[PDB]
Design a binder for this molecule. Structure first.
Ligand code: ADP
Length: 298
């Protein structure tokens, strides 16, 4: 966790998110009040969990980490709720996955802090806020939508990670990794770790473009940052479904993966980067996809 930002000042990018959260956070600390409930939404690896921890640290309260799919029976939820101290942060990742039982219980503690529960701050995280129910969603006073990071922001994150790992890196090299990070800090840091391994084995003084290219070849990451499965999704649509449109369920079954993982984990970046598009009849690949994967444009 040595690479995990401990405060907003150490959290690169997400300017709109930071200013909104900072405003609410500072104000609450100044008044000694419990912070309004916060919902963090965006694809994986963007910093939702990191922001949840930062919120508690800034408030100087304790954070209770839990997972929606974990809270099965009301007993589990009720127990966690009663363990909360005034001002504590209850962090629920994949909160939209809470069953009606534990959800209705949680909702109750939000209306009047009684199911007596100590006033606390509910911080939920989900890949997409739309997955939450109408009731629970309207209970969040602050909703922070995180989008993919820019290449410039990612480069900054990469240089920071390199420094923390005691390794020198050239700007052009950091740029190359960032361009292949699929707009995600998690990916950018893992790629940096792997590039570090290559520097180690080739005994270099610092990471350059050559070292990065060698690493990307070993990792099978192309010039667009797409990995094996990313290409597998596009190739399946192209070859089996003639480019689409293909329904999410049909596509997921052909790939042997859950539909949720496909649409919530991999599709986001592919849509953002213009390789995929969604239509009422289903997903389709774009001309950019065909060209990039060197498939004859039908
Ligand atoms: N803005 C950022 N600056 C630096 N590192 C970041 C940032 N956002 C995320 N990370 C890093 O990426 C990893 C992924 O973050 P995490 O908060 O777990 O993502 P999420 O909960 O959205 O899946 C963490 O290692 C973290 O320390």
């Amino acid at each position: 966790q040595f690479l995990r930002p401990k405060s907003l000042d150490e959290f690169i990018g997400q300017e709109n998110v930071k200013k909104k959260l900072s405003l609410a956070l500072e104000a609450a600390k100044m008044r000694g009040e419990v912070l309004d409930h916060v919902l963090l939404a965006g694809p994986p690896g963007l910093g939702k969990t990191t922001l949840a921890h930062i919120i508690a640290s800034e408030l100087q309260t304790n954070i209770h980490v839990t997972s929606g799919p974990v809270l099965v029976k009301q007993g589990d939820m009720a127990a966690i709720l009663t363990s909360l101290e005034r001002g504590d942060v209850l962090f629920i990742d994949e909160i939209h996955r809470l069953n009606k039982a534990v959800e209705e219980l949680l909702y109750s503690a939000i209306e009047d802090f009684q199911i007596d529960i100590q006033p606390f701050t509910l911080v939920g995280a989900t890949v997409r806020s739309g997955l939450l129910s109408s009731p629970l969603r309207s209970r969040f006073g602050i909703i922070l939508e995180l989008d993919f990071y820019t290449v410039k922001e990612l480069k900054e994150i990469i240089k920071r990670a390199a420094s923390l790992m005691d390794v020198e890196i050239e700007d052009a090299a950091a740029e190359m990794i960032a361009k292949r990070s699929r707009g995600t800090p998690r990916i950018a840091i893992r790629l940096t770790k792997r590039v570090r391994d290559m520097l180690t084995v080739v005994k270099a003084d610092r990471i350059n473009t050559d070292i990065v290219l060698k690493t990307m070849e070993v990792l099978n990451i192309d010039d667009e940052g797409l990995d094996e499965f990313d290409r597998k999704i596009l190739k399946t649509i192209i070859e089996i479904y003639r480019g689409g449109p293909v329904g999410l369920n049909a596509l997921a079954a052909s790939l042997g993966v859950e539909a949720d993982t496909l649409s919530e984990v991999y599709e986001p970046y592919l849509l953002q980067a213009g390789f995929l598009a969604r239509t009422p009849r289903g997903r389709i690949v774009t001309e950019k996809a065909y060209k990039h994967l060197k498939y004859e444009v039908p």
